[PDB]
């Protein structure tokens, strides 16, 4: 430490918080020229504390003034490091502030977004927070540095090329800035790095080197008798001190969490389940509980993104699948890093349960035994990033939000890696719609370019809205955009489904596994127990009584539609999903539902931000109505 150029009362607040000597990926991160201002690329697989290299390159800058800034994707990550750096680093004198796409709903489980102010000399934020912001031309000023946490969400093709647009607007933005790209461990680091700029720090070492080993199954239920008697026996193992020994479980869909925590709960093991869809208060109470030694199970998806703070000394896979979508190898691997850094103690253990030949659905590509040797002796995947038509005119479009000159749209297009096309070719194809108006070589960004593009809304949404406006109601505009999707069916009537048809039956409600059975009333209906039948039939009823031979649109706005008036009425997503239980026997997430209003609220949002603009009043005072009426309820 003593030996790092970098002030000394920053040393000083970091030695009272518990540090000695640079970690391996540190170290290298260090003699690559961090601390001269140079823009490095860090790769390394997560669990080693690849957060920590982003402080490293901004906090002395900032330390004069120069404010940092952090970028994460998702939103407890944000939380969980804005509330570390705060706590760490006020106690120096720097005002520390988060920025996100603020919460709108008002509920007591939730979090309040405090603290966005751009004086802070210390900034955290998302990545649409932050892209909602510079779309509308707004500056932050005096950043120095720049670090990107769990970047490689490029390759998933939804975040990735508005991701890749916002960096090439950045490096536009702060050159000067000294620039930090954290990701764990993915495939192609040599001519990725090359492509950016970046001096590439590789760290293919596990932090902590695994203990792997299988096990077979016959079927099902000897699986989950093994996962019992692992759990067990993990459980009891100790350290030289009295302990215990704590596992977790990626099994492939939520409901099967649940279903696996209470059988090992039944079995006498402290149990529990672990995803989004759970209320935020007996979500973060279980990691607090596992975290204590309280637990002993955790059952969970991949849906474990970063953030979560969360040891074991064991891991367990009953199945390979997300859905039914083979795991990555990547997904696979950053699976098994929340194994080995875990166990305090022990090399961690991994188990993986295997039917052979089991394809869990039909459309998977290959048995979860060919799955299982994929995942485990692959290296893992090349990030890909490829703009779709519309992604490349949104990207060209916040371009314009923030740029006003055709040289500059021009050379940042050039900079980006996703564009399949140039920059003047969508500023005329927006010209066509007059989103912008190109009077060369500037372009002029118009109002409605201007909150379409602050909305983040597709091109055909935008034209949608446009088109309808007054014709139709904010809930009937809002609710076409985006209703309502994951809702599926009660134990006991997915079971008596997959049984009364002789074939593979999906879970959720919108699959064609159901449809085939909608469309057999007078043959699927007379097979079933009275409550079974009772509720399927009150379900027809309600959502597919449909004057269309189609019926899925029609169930999914009417579910979505009871869903807001569940919330006017001054329900919370507690109340609504257990009372969709207790009539329909359907599960729907409070997580999910919570979050779901809260992007109807940010549609409604956009709604009058273009009714503003075009001076539509109808909607404009009615979706500011209804928009309070879902907020307060």
């Known amino acids: 430490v003593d030996e790092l150029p970098v002030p000394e009362k920053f040393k000083e607040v970091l030695k009272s918080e518990g540090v000695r000597e640079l970690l391996p990926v540190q170290s290298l991160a260090v003699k690559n020229g961090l601390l001269d201002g140079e823009n490095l690329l860090v790769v390394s697989a997560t669990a080693s504390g690849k957060t920590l290299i982003g402080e490293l390159a901004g906090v002395p800058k900032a330390m004069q003034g120069k404010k940092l800034l952090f970028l994460v994707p998702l939103v407890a990550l944000a939380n969980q490091k804005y509330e570390d750096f705060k706590r760490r680093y006020s106690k120096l004198g720097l005002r520390v502030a988060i920025r996100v796409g603020m919460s709108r709903i008002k509920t007591k489980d939730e979090l309040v977004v405090v603290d966005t102010g751009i004086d802070a000399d210390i900034i955290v934020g998302t990545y649409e927070g932050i892209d909602y912001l510079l779309r509308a031309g707004r500056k932050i000023g005096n950043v120095g540095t720049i670090v990107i946490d769990e970047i490689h969400t490029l390759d998933d093709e939804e975040r990735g090329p508005r991701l890749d647009g916002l960096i090439a607007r950045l490096r536009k933005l702060y050159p000067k800035a000294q620039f930090i790209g954290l990701s764990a461990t993915v495939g192609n680091p040599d001519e990725l790095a090359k492509e950016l700029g970046l001096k590439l720090v590789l760290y293919d070492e596990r932090p902590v080197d695994l203990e792997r080993h299988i096990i077979i199954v016959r079927n099902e239920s000897e699986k989950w008798r093994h996962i019992a008697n692992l759990c067990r026996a993990e459980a009891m193992r100790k350290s030289k001190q009295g302990y215990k020994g704590q596992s977790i479980v990626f099994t492939f869909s939520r409901k099967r969490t649940h279903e696996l925590a209470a059988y090992l709960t039944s079995k006498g093991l402290k149990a529990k389940p672990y995803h ?17 030694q309280r637990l002993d199970v955790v059952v969970t998806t991949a849906a474990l993104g970063a953030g979560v703070d969360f040891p074991a000394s064991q891991v367990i896979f009953e199945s390979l699948a997300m859905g039914n979508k083979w795991l990555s190898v990547r997904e696979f691997h950053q699976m098994l890093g929340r194994a080995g850094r875990p166990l305090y103690h022990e090399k961690g253990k991994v188990y993986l349960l295997v039917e052979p030949g089991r394809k869990y659905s039909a459309q998977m590509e290959g048995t979860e035994d060919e799955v299982a040797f994929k995942l485990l002796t692959a290296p ?58 190109m009077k060369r070589p500037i372009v002029e960004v118009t109002p409605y370019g201007r909150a379409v593009s602050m909305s983040f809304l597709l091109p055909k949404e935008a034209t949608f809205i446009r088109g309808n406006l007054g014709k139709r109601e904010a809930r009937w505009i809002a609710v076409k955009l985006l209703p309502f999707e994951n809702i599926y069916l009660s134990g006991t009537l997915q079971r008596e489904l997959e049984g009364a048809v002789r074939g593979r039956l999906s879970a959720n409600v919108f699959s064609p596994s159901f449809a085939s059975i909608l469309e057999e009333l007078d043959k699927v209906i007379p097979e079933l127990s009275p409550n079974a039948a009772e509720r399927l039939f009150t379900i027809y009823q309600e959502f597919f009584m449909c004057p269309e031979e189609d019926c899925t649109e029609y169930a999914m706005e009417r579910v979505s539609n009871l869903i807001i008036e569940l919330r006017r009425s001054g329900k919370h997503p507690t109340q609504i999903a257990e009372h969709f239980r207790k009539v329909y026997g359907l599960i729907v997430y409070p997580g999910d539902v919570f979050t779901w209003l809260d992007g109807i609220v940010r549609k409604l949002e956009a709604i009058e931000r273009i009714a503003r603009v075009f001076r539509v009043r109808k909607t404009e005072e009615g979706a500011k109505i209804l928009k309070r009426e879902i907020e307060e309820g």
């Open 276 to 292: 989004s869809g759970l209320p935020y208060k007996q979500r973060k109470l279980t990691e607090m509980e596992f975290l204590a």
């Open 380 to 437: 893992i995947e090349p990030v890909q990033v490829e703009w779709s038509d519309e992604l490349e005119q949104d990207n060209v479009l916040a371009h314009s939000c923030v740029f006003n000159r055709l040289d500059v749209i021009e050379e940042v297009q050039s900079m980006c890696l996703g564009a399949n096309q140039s920059a003047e070719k969508v500023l005329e194809k927006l010209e066509e719609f007059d989103f912008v108006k």
